[PDB]
Amino acid sequence: MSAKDERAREILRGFKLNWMNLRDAETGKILWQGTEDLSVPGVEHEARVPKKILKCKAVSRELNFSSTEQMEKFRLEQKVYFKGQCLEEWFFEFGFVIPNSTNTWQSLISAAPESQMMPASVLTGNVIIETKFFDDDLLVSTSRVRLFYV
Ligand SMILES: O=C1c2ccccc2N[C@@H](c2ccccc2F)N1CCN1CCC(N2C(=O)c3ccccc3N[C@H]2c2ccccc2F)CC1
Protein backbone atom coordinates (compact mmCIF):
# COMPACT_ATOMS: atom_id res chain seq x y z
CA MET A 1 0.00 0.00 0.00
CA SER A 2 1.83 3.05 -1.38
CA ALA A 3 0.94 6.72 -1.21
CA LYS A 4 -0.02 6.63 -4.89
CA ASP A 5 -2.42 3.74 -4.19
CA GLU A 6 -4.10 5.74 -1.39
CA ARG A 7 -4.42 8.79 -3.68
CA ALA A 8 -5.96 6.70 -6.49
CA ARG A 9 -8.57 5.49 -4.01
CA GLU A 10 -9.33 8.97 -2.78
CA ILE A 11 -9.96 10.17 -6.33
CA LEU A 12 -12.13 7.20 -7.09
CA ARG A 13 -14.10 7.86 -3.88
CA GLY A 14 -14.81 11.47 -4.91
CA PHE A 15 -15.56 10.77 -8.55
CA LYS A 16 -18.96 10.42 -10.16
CA LEU A 17 -20.12 10.27 -13.77
CA ASN A 18 -23.51 12.05 -13.75
CA TRP A 19 -24.60 11.70 -17.37
CA MET A 20 -23.49 10.96 -20.90
CA ASN A 21 -24.58 11.03 -24.53
CA LEU A 22 -23.38 9.80 -27.89
CA ARG A 23 -24.24 11.55 -31.13
CA ASP A 24 -23.51 10.91 -34.82
CA ALA A 25 -20.77 13.39 -35.55
CA GLU A 26 -22.26 14.12 -39.03
CA THR A 27 -25.92 14.67 -38.18
CA GLY A 28 -25.69 15.54 -34.50
CA LYS A 29 -28.55 13.10 -33.85
CA ILE A 30 -28.60 11.46 -30.40
CA LEU A 31 -27.79 7.73 -30.50
CA TRP A 32 -27.62 7.06 -26.73
CA GLN A 33 -28.07 8.94 -23.50
CA GLY A 34 -28.05 7.91 -19.87
CA THR A 35 -27.53 8.71 -16.25
CA GLU A 36 -26.12 5.26 -15.18
CA ASP A 37 -22.64 5.74 -13.76
CA LEU A 38 -20.82 3.53 -16.34
CA SER A 39 -17.45 4.27 -14.63
CA VAL A 40 -18.20 2.17 -11.54
CA PRO A 41 -15.66 -0.60 -11.39
CA GLY A 42 -16.03 -4.17 -10.49
CA VAL A 43 -19.40 -4.91 -12.14
CA GLU A 44 -20.23 -5.50 -15.76
CA HIS A 45 -22.46 -2.72 -16.97
CA GLU A 46 -24.70 -3.31 -19.98
CA ALA A 47 -25.90 -0.86 -22.59
CA ARG A 48 -27.97 -0.93 -25.73
CA VAL A 49 -27.08 1.24 -28.64
CA PRO A 50 -28.72 1.46 -32.06
CA LYS A 51 -26.91 -0.59 -34.63
CA LYS A 52 -26.63 2.41 -36.91
CA ILE A 53 -23.73 3.62 -34.68
CA LEU A 54 -21.62 1.11 -36.53
CA LYS A 55 -22.14 3.15 -39.75
CA CYS A 56 -20.89 6.39 -38.22
CA LYS A 57 -17.48 7.62 -39.30
CA ALA A 58 -17.20 9.43 -35.99
CA VAL A 59 -19.19 9.63 -32.77
CA SER A 60 -19.50 12.77 -30.66
CA ARG A 61 -19.47 12.14 -26.88
CA GLU A 62 -20.61 14.47 -24.23
CA LEU A 63 -19.76 13.32 -20.67
CA ASN A 64 -20.64 15.11 -17.36
CA PHE A 65 -18.63 14.21 -14.24
CA SER A 66 -17.97 15.48 -10.70
CA SER A 67 -14.74 15.13 -8.70
CA THR A 68 -14.17 16.13 -5.08
CA GLU A 69 -10.49 15.63 -5.76
CA GLN A 70 -8.21 17.78 -7.76
CA MET A 71 -6.63 16.03 -10.76
CA GLU A 72 -3.62 17.22 -12.65
CA LYS A 73 -4.20 15.34 -15.91
CA PHE A 74 -7.43 13.47 -16.04
CA ARG A 75 -7.48 11.16 -19.02
CA LEU A 76 -8.99 7.92 -20.34
CA GLU A 77 -7.77 4.90 -22.23
CA GLN A 78 -10.54 2.97 -23.89
CA LYS A 79 -10.46 -0.39 -25.67
CA VAL A 80 -12.96 -2.28 -27.78
CA TYR A 81 -12.81 -6.03 -27.13
CA PHE A 82 -14.56 -8.60 -29.27
CA LYS A 83 -14.67 -12.00 -27.71
CA GLY A 84 -11.65 -11.04 -25.57
CA GLN A 85 -9.61 -9.63 -28.47
CA CYS A 86 -8.70 -5.85 -28.79
CA LEU A 87 -9.85 -4.36 -32.08
CA GLU A 88 -9.39 -0.66 -31.33
CA GLU A 89 -7.99 1.75 -28.68
CA TRP A 90 -8.46 5.48 -27.94
CA PHE A 91 -6.74 8.00 -25.69
CA PHE A 92 -8.53 11.14 -24.57
CA GLU A 93 -7.20 13.88 -22.38
CA PHE A 94 -9.38 16.19 -20.25
CA GLY A 95 -6.50 17.76 -18.24
CA PHE A 96 -6.73 19.66 -15.02
CA VAL A 97 -9.77 19.24 -12.81
CA ILE A 98 -10.68 21.66 -10.06
CA PRO A 99 -11.53 19.96 -6.72
CA ASN A 100 -15.33 19.88 -6.14
CA SER A 101 -16.17 20.83 -9.74
CA THR A 102 -18.74 19.44 -12.10
CA ASN A 103 -17.59 19.40 -15.72
CA THR A 104 -18.92 18.63 -19.22
CA TRP A 105 -16.40 17.06 -21.49
CA GLN A 106 -16.80 16.89 -25.22
CA SER A 107 -14.90 14.28 -27.27
CA LEU A 108 -14.92 13.06 -30.87
CA ILE A 109 -14.55 9.30 -31.36
CA SER A 110 -13.19 8.30 -34.80
CA ALA A 111 -13.73 4.90 -36.36
CA ALA A 112 -10.39 3.36 -37.49
CA PRO A 113 -10.56 4.00 -41.31
CA GLU A 114 -8.52 0.89 -42.42
CA SER A 115 -10.89 -1.59 -40.62
CA GLN A 116 -14.27 -2.91 -41.84
CA MET A 117 -17.02 -3.35 -39.25
CA MET A 118 -18.45 -6.81 -38.60
CA PRO A 119 -22.24 -6.73 -38.68
CA ALA A 120 -24.34 -5.82 -35.62
CA SER A 121 -25.79 -9.25 -35.32
CA VAL A 122 -22.31 -10.75 -34.90
CA LEU A 123 -21.05 -8.03 -32.58
CA THR A 124 -24.06 -7.87 -30.31
CA GLY A 125 -23.37 -9.01 -26.73
CA ASN A 126 -19.81 -9.95 -27.73
CA VAL A 127 -18.32 -6.47 -27.46
CA ILE A 128 -16.84 -5.11 -24.16
CA ILE A 129 -15.65 -1.53 -23.84
CA GLU A 130 -12.89 -1.30 -21.19
CA THR A 131 -12.33 2.25 -19.88
CA LYS A 132 -9.38 3.10 -17.66
CA PHE A 133 -9.53 6.37 -15.76
CA PHE A 134 -6.15 7.93 -15.03
CA ASP A 135 -4.89 11.09 -13.41
CA ASP A 136 -1.63 11.29 -15.36
CA ASP A 137 0.01 7.92 -14.73
CA LEU A 138 -2.10 7.03 -11.80
CA LEU A 139 -4.78 4.35 -12.47
CA VAL A 140 -7.89 5.35 -10.64
CA SER A 141 -10.20 2.79 -12.08
CA THR A 142 -11.15 0.33 -14.76
CA SER A 143 -14.65 -0.29 -15.74
CA ARG A 144 -16.39 -2.50 -18.40
CA VAL A 145 -19.56 -2.15 -20.43
CA ARG A 146 -20.95 -4.98 -22.59
CA LEU A 147 -22.77 -3.61 -25.71
CA PHE A 148 -25.88 -4.79 -27.45
CA TYR A 149 -26.62 -3.33 -30.84
CA VAL A 150 -30.41 -3.03 -31.20
O1 LIG B 1 -19.30 -0.33 -31.01
C1 LIG B 1 -18.26 0.11 -31.52
C2 LIG B 1 -17.36 -0.69 -32.29
C3 LIG B 1 -17.61 -2.03 -32.58
C4 LIG B 1 -16.68 -2.84 -33.29
C5 LIG B 1 -15.48 -2.32 -33.72
C6 LIG B 1 -15.21 -0.98 -33.41
C7 LIG B 1 -16.12 -0.18 -32.71
N1 LIG B 1 -15.78 1.10 -32.41
C8 LIG B 1 -16.76 2.05 -31.90
C9 LIG B 1 -17.23 2.89 -32.98
C10 LIG B 1 -18.23 2.48 -33.89
C11 LIG B 1 -18.61 3.35 -34.89
C12 LIG B 1 -18.06 4.63 -35.03
C13 LIG B 1 -17.10 5.07 -34.15
C14 LIG B 1 -16.71 4.18 -33.14
F1 LIG B 1 -15.88 4.54 -32.39
N2 LIG B 1 -17.94 1.40 -31.26
C15 LIG B 1 -18.83 2.29 -30.43
C16 LIG B 1 -18.25 2.34 -28.98
N3 LIG B 1 -17.68 3.66 -28.67
C17 LIG B 1 -16.46 3.69 -27.77
C18 LIG B 1 -16.84 3.58 -26.33
C19 LIG B 1 -17.71 4.74 -25.98
N4 LIG B 1 -17.91 4.75 -24.48
C20 LIG B 1 -17.57 5.82 -23.74
O2 LIG B 1 -16.97 6.76 -24.33
C21 LIG B 1 -17.62 5.71 -22.30
C22 LIG B 1 -17.35 6.79 -21.49
C23 LIG B 1 -17.36 6.65 -20.12
C24 LIG B 1 -17.56 5.44 -19.52
C25 LIG B 1 -17.80 4.36 -20.33
C26 LIG B 1 -17.81 4.50 -21.68
N5 LIG B 1 -18.07 3.39 -22.42
C27 LIG B 1 -18.59 3.59 -23.79
C28 LIG B 1 -19.99 3.81 -23.71
C29 LIG B 1 -20.59 5.09 -23.75
C30 LIG B 1 -21.99 5.26 -23.67
C31 LIG B 1 -22.82 4.14 -23.61
C32 LIG B 1 -22.23 2.88 -23.61
C33 LIG B 1 -20.84 2.73 -23.65
F2 LIG B 1 -20.35 1.55 -23.62
C34 LIG B 1 -19.01 4.61 -26.76
C35 LIG B 1 -18.75 4.62 -28.29
Side-chain angles (χ1 to χ4, degrees):
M1 200 60 192
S2 74
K4 283 187 194 206
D5 294 334
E6 171 61 30
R7 175 70 188 146
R9 287 184 181 189
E10 266 304 304
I11 296 176
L12 172 62
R13 185 177 166 79
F15 182 93
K16 171 86 180 150
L17 196 166
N18 305 124
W19 54 259
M20 181 161 42
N21 57 243
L22 298 184
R23 292 180 303 116
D24 186 313
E26 290 290 353
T27 141
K29 284 272 161 40
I30 291 169
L31 309 169
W32 189 84
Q33 65 177 356
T35 50
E36 204 197 316
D37 189 337
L38 293 188
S39 73
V40 177
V43 295
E44 188 182 281
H45 298 99
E46 245 84 352
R48 299 164 190 185
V49 300
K51 60 187 59 148
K52 47 173 191 293
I53 190 160
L54 300 161
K55 313 296 188 155
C56 292
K57 238 147 51 48
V59 168
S60 157
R61 180 179 62 206
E62 187 167 60
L63 189 167
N64 185 268
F65 69 93
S66 307
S67 181
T68 62
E69 308 309 295
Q70 177 160 303
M71 291 183 263
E72 311 295 305
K73 186 176 194 177
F74 173 44
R75 78 184 175 79
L76 309 171
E77 290 179 4
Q78 300 183 282
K79 286 175 171 174
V80 178
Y81 280 99
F82 168 83
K83 299 195 185 179
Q85 176 171 333
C86 183
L87 308 182
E88 191 167 15
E89 184 162 15
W90 301 264
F91 304 80
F92 298 103
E93 175 176 323
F94 178 84
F96 176 80
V97 176
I98 280 150
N100 299 116
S101 62
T102 288
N103 308 264
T104 285
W105 182 10
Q106 205 134 322
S107 290
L108 170 70
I109 311 171
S110 290
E114 16 61 291
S115 294
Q116 304 80 56
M117 284 293 183
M118 275 179 279
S121 65
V122 171
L123 294 171
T124 194
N126 287 126
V127 168
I128 292 285
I129 308 302
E130 183 197 66
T131 301
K132 284 170 172 179
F133 294 77
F134 282 96
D135 173 4
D136 211 334
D137 293 302
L138 194 61
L139 188 56
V140 170
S141 91
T142 305
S143 62
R144 299 177 214 289
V145 183
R146 185 178 300 280
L147 296 181
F148 305 98
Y149 296 96
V150 311

PDB file of all heavy atoms in Angstrom, residues 56-68:
ATOM      1  N   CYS A  56     -21.299   5.013 -38.388  1.00  0.00           N
ATOM      2  CA  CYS A  56     -20.890   6.392 -38.223  1.00  0.00           C
ATOM      3  C   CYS A  56     -19.414   6.421 -38.430  1.00  0.00           C
ATOM      4  O   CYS A  56     -18.711   5.547 -37.921  1.00  0.00           O
ATOM      5  CB  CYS A  56     -21.214   6.906 -36.832  1.00  0.00           C
ATOM      6  SG  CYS A  56     -22.965   7.065 -36.502  1.00  0.00           S
ATOM      7  N   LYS A  57     -18.928   7.441 -39.132  1.00  0.00           N
ATOM      8  CA  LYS A  57     -17.484   7.617 -39.300  1.00  0.00           C
ATOM      9  C   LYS A  57     -16.867   8.148 -37.997  1.00  0.00           C
ATOM     10  O   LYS A  57     -15.789   7.707 -37.571  1.00  0.00           O
ATOM     11  CB  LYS A  57     -17.186   8.502 -40.508  1.00  0.00           C
ATOM     12  CG  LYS A  57     -16.293   7.804 -41.545  1.00  0.00           C
ATOM     13  CD  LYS A  57     -16.613   8.232 -42.975  1.00  0.00           C
ATOM     14  CE  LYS A  57     -16.651   9.755 -43.139  1.00  0.00           C
ATOM     15  NZ  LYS A  57     -15.480  10.472 -42.541  1.00  0.00           N
ATOM     16  N   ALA A  58     -17.607   9.007 -37.318  1.00  0.00           N
ATOM     17  CA  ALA A  58     -17.204   9.428 -35.988  1.00  0.00           C
ATOM     18  C   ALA A  58     -18.407   9.627 -35.085  1.00  0.00           C
ATOM     19  O   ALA A  58     -19.527   9.949 -35.542  1.00  0.00           O
ATOM     20  CB  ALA A  58     -16.405  10.726 -36.046  1.00  0.00           C
ATOM     21  N   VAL A  59     -18.162   9.425 -33.790  1.00  0.00           N
ATOM     22  CA  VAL A  59     -19.192   9.626 -32.771  1.00  0.00           C
ATOM     23  C   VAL A  59     -18.789  10.770 -31.826  1.00  0.00           C
ATOM     24  O   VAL A  59     -17.661  10.816 -31.340  1.00  0.00           O
ATOM     25  CB  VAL A  59     -19.436   8.334 -32.007  1.00  0.00           C
ATOM     26  CG1 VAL A  59     -20.273   8.562 -30.768  1.00  0.00           C
ATOM     27  CG2 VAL A  59     -20.090   7.319 -32.931  1.00  0.00           C
ATOM     28  N   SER A  60     -19.731  11.674 -31.565  1.00  0.00           N
ATOM     29  CA  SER A  60     -19.498  12.774 -30.657  1.00  0.00           C
ATOM     30  C   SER A  60     -20.035  12.414 -29.251  1.00  0.00           C
ATOM     31  O   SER A  60     -21.202  12.071 -29.076  1.00  0.00           O
ATOM     32  CB  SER A  60     -20.151  14.043 -31.240  1.00  0.00           C
ATOM     33  OG  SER A  60     -20.415  14.985 -30.244  1.00  0.00           O
ATOM     34  N   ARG A  61     -19.152  12.490 -28.268  1.00  0.00           N
ATOM     35  CA  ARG A  61     -19.471  12.138 -26.876  1.00  0.00           C
ATOM     36  C   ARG A  61     -19.524  13.370 -26.018  1.00  0.00           C
ATOM     37  O   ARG A  61     -18.622  14.240 -26.076  1.00  0.00           O
ATOM     38  CB  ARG A  61     -18.419  11.217 -26.272  1.00  0.00           C
ATOM     39  CG  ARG A  61     -18.720  10.832 -24.820  1.00  0.00           C
ATOM     40  CD  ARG A  61     -17.657   9.901 -24.249  1.00  0.00           C
ATOM     41  NE  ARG A  61     -16.325  10.523 -24.214  1.00  0.00           N
ATOM     42  CZ  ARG A  61     -15.168   9.840 -24.250  1.00  0.00           C
ATOM     43  NH1 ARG A  61     -15.157   8.511 -24.327  1.00  0.00           N
ATOM     44  NH2 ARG A  61     -14.007  10.484 -24.245  1.00  0.00           N
ATOM     45  N   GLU A  62     -20.553  13.438 -25.194  1.00  0.00           N
ATOM     46  CA  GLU A  62     -20.609  14.475 -24.227  1.00  0.00           C
ATOM     47  C   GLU A  62     -20.795  13.796 -22.866  1.00  0.00           C
ATOM     48  O   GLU A  62     -21.766  13.068 -22.652  1.00  0.00           O
ATOM     49  CB  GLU A  62     -21.775  15.370 -24.596  1.00  0.00           C
ATOM     50  CG  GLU A  62     -21.873  16.610 -23.760  1.00  0.00           C
ATOM     51  CD  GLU A  62     -22.839  17.623 -24.345  1.00  0.00           C
ATOM     52  OE1 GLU A  62     -24.042  17.282 -24.496  1.00  0.00           O
ATOM     53  OE2 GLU A  62     -22.369  18.751 -24.653  1.00  0.00           O
ATOM     54  N   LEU A  63     -19.892  14.068 -21.938  1.00  0.00           N
ATOM     55  CA  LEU A  63     -19.758  13.322 -20.673  1.00  0.00           C
ATOM     56  C   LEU A  63     -19.708  14.313 -19.516  1.00  0.00           C
ATOM     57  O   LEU A  63     -18.912  15.241 -19.548  1.00  0.00           O
ATOM     58  CB  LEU A  63     -18.485  12.552 -20.768  1.00  0.00           C
ATOM     59  CG  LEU A  63     -18.085  11.508 -19.743  1.00  0.00           C
ATOM     60  CD1 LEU A  63     -16.917  10.734 -20.333  1.00  0.00           C
ATOM     61  CD2 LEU A  63     -17.681  12.185 -18.446  1.00  0.00           C
ATOM     62  N   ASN A  64     -20.591  14.159 -18.524  1.00  0.00           N
ATOM     63  CA  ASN A  64     -20.638  15.114 -17.362  1.00  0.00           C
ATOM     64  C   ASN A  64     -20.208  14.364 -16.105  1.00  0.00           C
ATOM     65  O   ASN A  64     -20.762  13.320 -15.814  1.00  0.00           O
ATOM     66  CB  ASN A  64     -22.052  15.631 -17.162  1.00  0.00           C
ATOM     67  CG  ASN A  64     -22.167  16.693 -16.072  1.00  0.00           C
ATOM     68  OD1 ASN A  64     -22.431  16.404 -14.898  1.00  0.00           O
ATOM     69  ND2 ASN A  64     -22.024  17.930 -16.480  1.00  0.00           N
ATOM     70  N   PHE A  65     -19.220  14.890 -15.401  1.00  0.00           N
ATOM     71  CA  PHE A  65     -18.631  14.213 -14.243  1.00  0.00           C
ATOM     72  C   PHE A  65     -18.347  15.199 -13.122  1.00  0.00           C
ATOM     73  O   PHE A  65     -18.189  16.373 -13.381  1.00  0.00           O
ATOM     74  CB  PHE A  65     -17.365  13.460 -14.637  1.00  0.00           C
ATOM     75  CG  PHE A  65     -16.216  14.361 -15.008  1.00  0.00           C
ATOM     76  CD1 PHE A  65     -15.283  14.737 -14.072  1.00  0.00           C
ATOM     77  CD2 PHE A  65     -16.043  14.788 -16.320  1.00  0.00           C
ATOM     78  CE1 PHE A  65     -14.213  15.571 -14.411  1.00  0.00           C
ATOM     79  CE2 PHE A  65     -14.989  15.593 -16.659  1.00  0.00           C
ATOM     80  CZ  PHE A  65     -14.087  16.031 -15.707  1.00  0.00           C
ATOM     81  N   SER A  66     -18.351  14.711 -11.884  1.00  0.00           N
ATOM     82  CA  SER A  66     -17.973  15.485 -10.697  1.00  0.00           C
ATOM     83  C   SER A  66     -16.774  14.838 -10.013  1.00  0.00           C
ATOM     84  O   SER A  66     -16.645  13.595  -9.996  1.00  0.00           O
ATOM     85  CB  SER A  66     -19.167  15.564  -9.698  1.00  0.00           C
ATOM     86  OG  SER A  66     -20.351  16.053 -10.351  1.00  0.00           O
ATOM     87  N   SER A  67     -15.897  15.658  -9.431  1.00  0.00           N
ATOM     88  CA  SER A  67     -14.737  15.132  -8.695  1.00  0.00           C
ATOM     89  C   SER A  67     -14.504  15.968  -7.496  1.00  0.00           C
ATOM     90  O   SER A  67     -14.267  17.136  -7.686  1.00  0.00           O
ATOM     91  CB  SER A  67     -13.495  15.164  -9.589  1.00  0.00           C
ATOM     92  OG  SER A  67     -12.366  14.649  -8.954  1.00  0.00           O
ATOM     93  N   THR A  68     -14.596  15.402  -6.277  1.00  0.00           N
ATOM     94  CA  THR A  68     -14.169  16.128  -5.078  1.00  0.00           C
ATOM     95  C   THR A  68     -12.699  16.372  -5.134  1.00  0.00           C
ATOM     96  O   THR A  68     -12.233  17.414  -4.736  1.00  0.00           O
ATOM     97  CB  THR A  68     -14.452  15.409  -3.701  1.00  0.00           C
ATOM     98  OG1 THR A  68     -13.735  14.183  -3.628  1.00  0.00           O
ATOM     99  CG2 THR A  68     -15.959  15.151  -3.527  1.00  0.00           C
TER     100      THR A  68
END
